[PDB]
Amino acid sequence: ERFPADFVWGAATAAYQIEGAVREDGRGVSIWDTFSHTPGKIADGTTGDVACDSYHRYGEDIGLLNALGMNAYRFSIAWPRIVPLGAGPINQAGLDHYSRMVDALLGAGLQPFVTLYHWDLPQPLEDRLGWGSRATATVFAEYADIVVRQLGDRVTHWATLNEPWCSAMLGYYLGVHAPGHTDLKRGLEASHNLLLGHGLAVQAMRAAAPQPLQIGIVLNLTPTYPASDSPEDVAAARRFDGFVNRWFLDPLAGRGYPQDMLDYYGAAAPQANPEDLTQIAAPLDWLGVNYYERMRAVDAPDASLPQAQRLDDPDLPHTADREVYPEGLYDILLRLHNDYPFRPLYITENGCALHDEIAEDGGIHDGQRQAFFEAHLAQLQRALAAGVPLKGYFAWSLLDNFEWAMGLSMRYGICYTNFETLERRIKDSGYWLRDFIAGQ
Numbered sequence: 142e143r144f145p146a147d148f149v150w151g152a153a154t155a156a157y158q159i160e161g162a163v164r165e166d167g168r169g170v171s172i173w174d175t176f177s178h179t180p181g182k183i184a185d186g187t188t189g190d191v192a193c194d195s196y197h198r199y200g201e202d203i204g205l206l207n208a209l210g211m212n213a214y215r216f217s218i219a220w221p222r223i224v225p226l227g228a229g230p231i232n233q234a235g236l237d238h239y240s241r242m243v244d245a246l247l248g249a250g251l252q253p254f255v256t257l258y259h260w261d262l263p264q265p266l267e268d269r270l271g272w273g274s275r276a277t278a279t280v281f282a283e284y285a286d287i288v289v290r291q292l293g294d295r296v297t298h299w300a301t302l303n304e305p306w307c308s309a310m311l312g313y314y315l316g317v318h319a320p321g322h323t324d325l326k327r328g329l330e331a332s333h334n335l336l337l338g339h340g341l342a343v344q345a346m347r348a349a350a351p352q353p354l355q356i357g358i359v360l361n362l363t364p365t366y367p368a369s370d371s372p373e374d375v376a377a378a379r380r381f382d383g384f385v386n387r388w389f390l391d392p393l394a395g396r397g398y399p400q401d402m403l404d405y406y407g408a409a410a411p412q413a414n415p416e417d418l419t420q421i422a423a424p425l426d427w428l429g430v431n432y433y434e435r436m437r438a439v440d441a442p443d444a445s446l447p448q449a450q451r452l453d454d455p456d457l458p459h460t461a462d463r464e465v466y467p468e469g470l471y472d473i474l475l476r477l478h479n480d481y482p483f484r485p486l487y488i489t490e491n492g493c494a495l496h497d498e499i500a501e502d503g504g505i506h507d508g509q510r511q512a513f514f515e516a517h518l519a520q521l522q523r524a525l526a527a528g529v530p531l532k533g534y535f536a537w538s539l540l541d542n543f544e545w546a547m548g549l550s551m552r553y554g555i556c557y558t559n560f561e562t563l564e565r566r567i568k569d570s571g572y573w574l575r576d577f578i579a580g581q
């Protein structure tokens with residue numbers, strides 16, 4: 142029934158999804174500015190130019206966090222505000238903005254959980270191949286050093302990357318996210334340079350830190366289940382598990398890249414010399430798990446790599462964009478606790494999208510999102526009972542925001558955002574979370 146008294150209860154955002162103010166105070170151009178302003182890439186013709194205007198309205202966001210009784214806020218720093226050319230001089234005005242925002246959070250009793258990279262690579266670095274270049278890993282570590290020097294007196298909990306699988310595979314292989322390339326070899330090279338950048342940044346941050354820091358990385362993980370016990374379906378499940386999960390977990394854990402996936406990728410695999418793998422396995426203080434969905438895998442030899450297709454389950458609840466399977470959160474946490482060395486663990490993203498509207502009474506009656514939270518929180522209690530060292534939970538998202546290639550049309554907030562007036566309103570699920578947390 143009860144969570145630990147010191148459990149972290151928060152909500153999460155990312156800079157490009159909320160901030161707007163894309164040309165203000167020296168901000169440079171990111172790959173997502175370029176991508177969202179490319180005709181046809183965003184489903185509804187919107188961009189992050191304004192989004193939630195949280196660059197100006199972060200005080201309102203703090204007011205919402207306080208009204209919800211949260212004790213932490215997970216947000217990202219925009220690299221284009223800090224080093225507008227990607228590699229080059231710092232923009233002190235960008236650092237000062239986040240310094241003030243951190244002070245406002247601390248003044249409100251909210252612990253800042255900062256993500257350094259949540260997908261907004263400076264465009265000048267992409268012009269020089271982006272994550273396809275080792276040099277980008279080096280300059281990412283330089284950016285991490287700069288930020289920790291100025292904010293590390295007040296922020297203890299830092300993550301390097303958010304969801305490198307998305308940045309690499311959606312951005313460079315499937316082309317659905319920025320920068321929009323469609324090449325497997327580039328995607329796999331990007332995955333390696335993201336991990337290398339992570340490892341270099343961890344070392345740089347520890348050297349630059351004014352106090353001991355708690356440094357993690359945030360991974361999206363998908364528990365995978367074979368559709369049947371046939372050799373073909375089991376192998377498809379293992380391949381998909383390798384494609385999403387083990388490709389990142391194993392090198393972070395000092396186990397190299399998984400051999401079965403190296404064999405499967407063949408010549409497309411990156412050239413990983415042992416010096417890189419040692420750097421990638423820099424010791425971490427925590428791991429963040431982003432969980433939305435499972436994969437029930439059926440062999441699909443004709444389909445594209447990794448030749449595994451999802452078997453939809455029509456009996457399970459579905460949201461606006463995903464299947465709901467709360468038990469998969471328990472499964473993946475038990476697997477991490479038993480099979481991998483990372484601890485403690487935080488749930489750094491969990492939430493759902495719905496076709497939310499403001500009702501006649503003024504509220505947003507998002508019962509499915511309340512049920513979503515209730516079901517996933519119950520699975521966390523089961524995991525804690527099994528001894529999983531879970532230390533906090535972050536709802537995705539504090540407010541409806543710019544949802545990448547879906548634009549403003551996919552609402553994940555516990556607070557509703559009117560994108561015309563920028564008013565925020567707490568949804569019913571947000572009041573449920575408030576009251577649940579207060580009971581803890």
Ligand SMILES: *[C@H]1O[C@H](CO)[C@@H](O)[C@H](O)[C@H]1F
Nearest residue numbers: 155303304431490537544
């Ligand atoms: C986790 O997934 C949500 C929903 O797709 C995104 O909005 C976040 O940026 C991502 F980190």
